[PDB]
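Build the 3D complex.
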Amino acid sequence: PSVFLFPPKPKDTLMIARTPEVTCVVVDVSHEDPEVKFNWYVDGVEVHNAKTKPREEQYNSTYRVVSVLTVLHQDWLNGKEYKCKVSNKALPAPIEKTISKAKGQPREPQVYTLPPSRDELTKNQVSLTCLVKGFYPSDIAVEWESNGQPENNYKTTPPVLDSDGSFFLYSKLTVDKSRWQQGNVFSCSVMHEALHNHYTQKSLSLS
Amino acid sequence: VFLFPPKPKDTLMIARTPEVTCVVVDVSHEDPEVKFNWYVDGVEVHNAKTKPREEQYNSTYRVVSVLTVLHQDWLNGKEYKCKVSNKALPAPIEKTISKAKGQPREPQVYTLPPSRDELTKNQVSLTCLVKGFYPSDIAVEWESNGQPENNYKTTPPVLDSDGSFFLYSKLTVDKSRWQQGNVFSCSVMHEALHNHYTQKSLSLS
Ligand SMILES: *[C@@H]1O[C@H](CO[C@@H]2O[C@@H](C)[C@@H](O)[C@@H](O)[C@@H]2O)[C@@H](O[C@@H]2O[C@H](CO)[C@@H](O[C@@H]3O[C@H](CO[C@H]4O[C@H](CO)[C@@H](O)[C@H](O)[C@@H]4O[C@@H]4O[C@H](CO)[C@@H](O)[C@H](O)[C@H]4NC(C)=O)[C@@H](O)[C@H](O[C@H]4O[C@H](CO)[C@@H](O)[C@H](O)[C@@H]4O[C@@H]4O[C@H](CO)[C@@H](O)[C@H](O)[C@H]4NC(C)=O)[C@@H]3O)[C@H](O)[C@H]2NC(C)=O)[C@H](O)[C@H]1NC(C)=O
Ligand SMILES: *[C@H]1O[C@H](CO[C@@H]2O[C@@H](C)[C@@H](O)[C@@H](O)[C@@H]2O)[C@@H](O[C@@H]2O[C@H](CO)[C@@H](O[C@@H]3O[C@H](CO[C@H]4O[C@H](CO)[C@@H](O)[C@H](O)[C@@H]4O[C@@H]4O[C@H](CO)[C@@H](O)[C@H](O)[C@H]4NC(C)=O)[C@@H](O)[C@H](O[C@H]4O[C@H](CO)[C@@H](O)[C@H](O)[C@@H]4O[C@@H]4O[C@H](CO)[C@@H](O)[C@H](O)[C@H]4NC(C)=O)[C@@H]3O)[C@H](O)[C@H]2NC(C)=O)[C@H](O)[C@H]1NC(C)=O
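Done.
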């Protein structure tokens, strides 16, 4: 009977309006002994606003019960740690997992937008590039848009540990070749803690 | 028990020696002994290279086999079965591996110069976008003046929306080396590429 612990989504914590939550998934408890008690601890202080939600079978014959705790944006951001104590009877001792933000100096992502190579203009779809380097920690969130409306054909690479201990990532946005050729401005929106207001944005259009 | 593919570069260069490894973490002092029957497309092979058995410290060892595959064999999608007979197990464990099936596609390679906004700095970013390839085994490298570069980092391959993959490679040079006009080059090595190897250049305009 194994147990997992997941951080809040980046976006959740850096937007006061949203609700960040750590999840304590428990895959594999057995029919034999079903019962599970979730004592949540925050910086050690036991919390009681647990949200142990029910309970879902599967196609391997073992359950999966999940808890959820709502963290404060600040609590998480300031590096507090969330302990999940999972008491079952298939185990001699209750399993534990601690999680928290990544320690160390948060650093401001730099954001450069990179136009399509000349060599791609042969095509009828074109690549816009957003290079976001220099950040820490690696929780971050990138999105594309134009004319105030969002874009949906973009994909983003994972954050890569750069040589200086910071992270980079790229975002590629794929538009029709004409939309660029005319002069539409497009924008890359980054959202990261070490950004002023947790959010910057760079633009990009034909010259 | 685990099973690892040859490195991309090994298979796409006739001169190198691609090899699948059958790592076995965790056998116990109690019962040490392990026999490695390798099978290729089912046909049992006997050029096994079971390399020695190194009783690791957590009282669990780790014995490794190695098989040398032919470049062809791998590239044509043959499958490599590893059958690991121990006595802590009732039945011998199995793992099969092979290349990824599916139409290999030629990577397009575009080199992208530094944003204007980075010229404030004293180190500058060169970008190599390599999109459209399949399978995702690929190898990217940077160089200039025929000599190699060493300050570059590369993102994993990302599953693009059309089933193909992209990745980017960032090379970090001093701001002057660019400002002057040094050509730099991104070297990609992938199966669907003619001669398994293309290369694009990049310099100040
Ligand atoms: C007792 O000790 C031994 C070793 O003793 C040591 O004790 C001290 C002294 C220290 O030295 C310690 O280092 C060490 O603990 C322990 O043995 C370890 O056991 C674990 C599992 O029990 C193994 O983990 C696996 O690791 C692989 C990948 O690891 C690569 O990179 C590692 C470096 O971080 C390296 O350790 C590995 O050797 C390996 O490196 C590659 O080597 C090959 C072979 O030559 C080479 O070609 C490559 O060059 C090289 N790689 C490169 C390029 O760098 C990991 O992939 C495994 O994960 C699979 O299984 C997981 C569950 O166990 C699962 O969660 C994962 O999802 C994954 O399953 C797969 O998932 C991927 C998704 O991407 C995908 O393939 C599939 O979806 C799925 N596969 C399928 C379909 O099944 C795995 O975690 C360690 O390798 C091993 N350590 C050693 C020595 O390698 C042992 O743990 C101890 N005893 C106990 C009780 O724990
Ligand atoms: C029978 O069925 C179930 C379910 O079927 C499963 O899913 C279906 C769809 C098929 O693909 C099946 O093949 C597959 O089996 C099986 O249940 C599985 O149980 C295993 C092990 O117990 C789990 O493996 C782990 O995977 C987690 C990752 O889980 C996240 O992502 C998953 C997919 O992305 C998702 O399923 C999870 O819900 C979760 O996703 C997140 O969910 C949260 C909220 O819950 C949400 O906030 C997020 O939005 C969402 N995230 C997103 C976007 O995806 C992973 O944590 C584990 O990896 C660690 O542990 C391994 C130990 O073996 C180790 O080898 C790994 O390398 C890795 O090690 C960790 O490393 C990190 C840093 O590298 C370190 O911090 C940790 O300390 C270290 N942990 C260690 C050492 O323990 C692990 O790989 C499966 O996720 C789980 N499947 C599902 C769907 O839940 C079941 O096993 C089957 N029966 C069998 C075969 O026994």
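The first strand of chain A starts at residue 21 and ends at 27.
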